Scaffold this active site. Structure first.
Site, PDB file in Angstrom:
ATOM      1  N   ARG A  58       1.069  -0.832   0.386  1.00  0.00           N
ATOM      2  CA  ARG A  58      -0.304   0.108  -0.316  1.00  0.00           C
ATOM      3  C   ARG A  58       0.680   1.142   0.224  1.00  0.00           C
ATOM      4  O   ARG A  58       0.997   2.188  -0.279  1.00  0.00           O
ATOM      5  CB  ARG A  58      -1.043  -0.059   1.407  1.00  0.00           C
ATOM      6  CG  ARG A  58      -2.297  -0.470   0.924  1.00  0.00           C
ATOM      7  CD  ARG A  58      -3.143  -1.287   2.496  1.00  0.00           C
ATOM      8  NE  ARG A  58      -1.946  -2.468   2.709  1.00  0.00           N
ATOM      9  CZ  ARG A  58      -2.875  -3.516   1.863  1.00  0.00           C
ATOM     10  NH1 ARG A  58      -4.245  -3.623   1.795  1.00  0.00           N
ATOM     11  NH2 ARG A  58      -2.614  -4.648   1.803  1.00  0.00           N
ATOM     12  N   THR A  59       1.813   1.655   0.965  1.00  0.00           N
ATOM     13  CA  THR A  59       2.676   2.489   0.819  1.00  0.00           C
ATOM     14  C   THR A  59       3.866   2.193  -0.924  1.00  0.00           C
ATOM     15  O   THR A  59       3.562   3.400  -0.815  1.00  0.00           O
ATOM     16  CB  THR A  59       3.621   2.077   2.389  1.00  0.00           C
ATOM     17  OG1 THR A  59       3.154   1.202   3.707  1.00  0.00           O
ATOM     18  CG2 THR A  59       4.408   3.290   2.503  1.00  0.00           C
ATOM     19  N   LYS A  81      25.520 -10.746   2.453  1.00  0.00           N
ATOM     20  CA  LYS A  81      25.711  -9.544   3.680  1.00  0.00           C
ATOM     21  C   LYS A  81      26.280  -8.618   2.812  1.00  0.00           C
ATOM     22  O   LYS A  81      27.743  -7.922   2.665  1.00  0.00           O
ATOM     23  CB  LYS A  81      26.836  -9.868   4.349  1.00  0.00           C
ATOM     24  N   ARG A 102      11.524   2.517   3.362  1.00  0.00           N
ATOM     25  CA  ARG A 102      11.319   1.661   4.411  1.00  0.00           C
ATOM     26  C   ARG A 102      12.130   0.899   4.880  1.00  0.00           C
ATOM     27  O   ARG A 102      12.494  -0.546   4.471  1.00  0.00           O
ATOM     28  CB  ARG A 102      10.074   0.834   4.541  1.00  0.00           C
ATOM     29  CG  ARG A 102       8.896   0.635   5.412  1.00  0.00           C
ATOM     30  CD  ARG A 102       7.818  -0.211   5.198  1.00  0.00           C
ATOM     31  NE  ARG A 102       7.027  -0.867   6.341  1.00  0.00           N
ATOM     32  CZ  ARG A 102       5.899  -0.257   6.596  1.00  0.00           C
ATOM     33  NH1 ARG A 102       5.323   1.071   6.471  1.00  0.00           N
ATOM     34  NH2 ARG A 102       5.508  -0.641   8.174  1.00  0.00           N
ATOM     35  N   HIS A 130       5.675   6.276  11.081  1.00  0.00           N
ATOM     36  CA  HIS A 130       4.864   6.310  10.124  1.00  0.00           C
ATOM     37  C   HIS A 130       4.512   7.327   9.468  1.00  0.00           C
ATOM     38  O   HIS A 130       3.312   7.426   9.591  1.00  0.00           O
ATOM     39  CB  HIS A 130       4.562   4.866   9.421  1.00  0.00           C
ATOM     40  CG  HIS A 130       4.356   4.337   8.168  1.00  0.00           C
ATOM     41  ND1 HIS A 130       3.748   4.267   7.571  1.00  0.00           N
ATOM     42  CD2 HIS A 130       5.074   5.339   7.135  1.00  0.00           C
ATOM     43  CE1 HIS A 130       3.145   3.744   6.399  1.00  0.00           C
ATOM     44  NE2 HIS A 130       4.229   4.843   5.919  1.00  0.00           N
TER      45      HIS A 130
END
Lengths: 291, 301, 300
Positions: A58-59, A81, A102, A130
């Site tokens: 959604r974000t 890594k 994010r 957020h």
């Protein structure tokens, strides 16, 4: 003056109530231009990097969509890594005009933003902060009911874990509100959350089901529980909520709202998501200093 | 006119560039950069589509081409079926194809029959034409010239395929070369001999400290702790290929440090604040070199 | 209105929902648009508009075709990556997007998602398996290549029992005057479902056992895959493969098509043959999709 130009946007804390309002007006203007289908070239020539290391779609979608609808382009970091996040962030900022980030590790979103030559918009950090979720949450309440001030805001579900509900509680103490908490004994609202709320002087009351918290609820703000029936909104239970109120949900849902509440005109969790595109459009336009 | 551009051409090696053609591409990147700075509505590749096909990961290369494409005003289209058919199917949709494939020969044969031009983004013989072009552009930019420069390549030089090609490109320039590896992973004698045939001078050192005093261009790469020719060696050795602010105090004023990126520990973050720390400007330069590539190959410069 | 045969704002779930003048119109738009792309005419047709690309079966040729179409019209595209229901995601995408292109392998899932979706949903392949634009582009390609569809003989090769595109296309053809031929292995025949209905609609059908056999009287050779595990293989594998040698028995006015991807069944040596239109068929798909996207969104 009221647009947070060229700044990182790490928490809703940084907005003075007037920058908040300006943001909401700007999202209103963008929305209306979209509705009358103007040729929008606001961020034409600008590039947004989308860097998602915990997956909220959604974000990511709303932000990407928002950028498209301003005439902007998106580069999306689809990349064991490897390199330091800050390097990955620095490098992308060699291509883009703004980074949307994010990251679930605590500290990281901020550490990545630290020497970054471009503005990082935080889209969800290690402490569940957020801002655009919080901004779209408020913006929705005001849009649906006319005002934020003078409302009863009831939160349902796993309130122990879901840390954006705890984002919204604190922020809602900048308004005149009374907060209700529905949550099973094991997943109740944490204390330092309730302490800050009281510390800023906001009335709070814990309830054990939706049914008993409902008749006076103006905003029923629903959330998943995960691992019973005292936290599942149904059209049955809705026969009691006021006539004017709205049911909100940050999404995704699974159990907590029955599909038959969707045609209820008070069901606002899809309008809410759409508001998100528009406030994000506003934050982008504003961060890049056009609006 | 377009006498300097590779309009319609597959871009497979830096060896297919002359003095003039490279010179044109550097001036165009320059030109395009300035147009971007002055906020000019660039629809140079409006109506154009780029297919991005990255069979190996290289976030630095792939994000770069998309950015360049998006700023010219164009679009970017980002298992089992043969490479030939895949590339040729993408070329039904798109004007250019940007292809990175690790299997020796793969890019080459994929271009052979392709209806559209193909830009090698990294192949299995380590040809990566835009990496070498951005490197040489970044040298000229930073120092005012490539000619007369002493260039010092650092790390695993035996398996640095693109760094051979780069040391091999620096043939066409009046330069002096230095190498800083562990004796295990020295620059290969295959390529050493190709650069000796040219008359370009080469020397080897064991550290950055040793090679650094008359170095104009420090080109850092990493080892990979696994690739040390023994753990004995590693523990006697690694401290000699790690750059820090104290190592740098012996560096010339007028000097630049480069890296293809990403890095591990070979370049300390404290270096980043040095004006001579170019590797991030290096990554920006590649975007403008790639802008210049897409636009000329597609016939707009 | 000039969009009197356009399905504006309508969910495109199947091709058997298109009238002839509706399909003819769409072909008209497909070409008009191609010619603009050829001319570099400024196409701001869908500028500012957003397509949601939701592909749960990685049909990367088909998604890239759509992505190409939207961008050539000036639009933009949102890629989708995969608790929440199908219909929730698609509703949520439709808050951001003007149109949702959706491909999903579960029976009824596409219709289920479009049912209460507030934005038009174009079926990019459903679980039965209606693939509306594949069928449309196959028809458009036959017509580009041969100049007609009527009176043609169309030979479908390969895994006919399992081939989805064959089934809907073969049904789609019964609205024209054609002659259908089938070249499958013994086991992998055109299913009795399909054969039974084409009979009921007029069209002639005829099974053959080999391409060499069927090819002399074939105007459209519609090739498809067979693969190892479907035979249930050694004795009959060579007969369902196209080589240039097999092609000496073909007409000069004839087309070989393939929805693709293809592996063994069309030799690489055939690609230089001018009757081989399967890559042109791919490019044709992009133009059919621009027409569709532009027609659904009220610009044609």
């Amino acid at each position: 003056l009221h647009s947070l130009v060229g700044q990182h946007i790490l928490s809703v804390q940084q907005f003075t109530k007037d920058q908040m309002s300006h943001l909401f007006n700007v999202a209103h203007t963008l929305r209306m231009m979209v509705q009358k289908e103007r040729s929008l070239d606001i961020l034409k020539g600008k590039v947004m990097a989308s860097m998602f290391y915990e997956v909220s779609t959604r974000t990511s979608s709303s932000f990407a969509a928002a950028m498209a609808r301003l005439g902007g382009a998106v580069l999306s970091f689809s990349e064991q890594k490897g390199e330091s996040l800050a390097d990955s962030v620095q490098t992308m900022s060699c291509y883009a005009d703004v980074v949307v980030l994010r990251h679930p590790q605590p500290g990281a979103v901020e550490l990545a933003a630290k020497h970054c030559r471009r503005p990082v918009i935080n889209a969800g950090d290690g402490v569940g902060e957020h801002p655009t979720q919080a901004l779209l949450d408020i913006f929705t309440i005001r849009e649906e009911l006319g005002t934020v001030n003078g409302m009863t805001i009831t939160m349902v579900g796993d309130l122990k874990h879901g840390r954006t509900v705890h984002s919204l509680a604190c922020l809602l103490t900048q308004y005149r509100v009374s907060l209700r908490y529905v949550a099973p004994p094991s997943l109740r609202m944490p204390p330092t959350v309730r302490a800050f709320v009281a510390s800023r002087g906001t009335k709070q009351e814990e309830f054990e089901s939706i049914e008993e918290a409902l008749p006076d609820t103006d905003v029923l703000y629903m959330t998943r529980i995960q691992k019973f029936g005292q936290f599942i909104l149904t059209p049955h239970i809705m026969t009691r909520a006021k006539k004017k109120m709205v049911v909100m949900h940050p999404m995704p849902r699974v159990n907590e709202i029955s599909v038959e509440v969707d045609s209820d005109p008070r069901a606002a969790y899809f309008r809410q998501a759409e508001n998100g595109m528009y406030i994000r459009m506003a934050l982008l336009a504003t961060v890049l200093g056009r609006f």
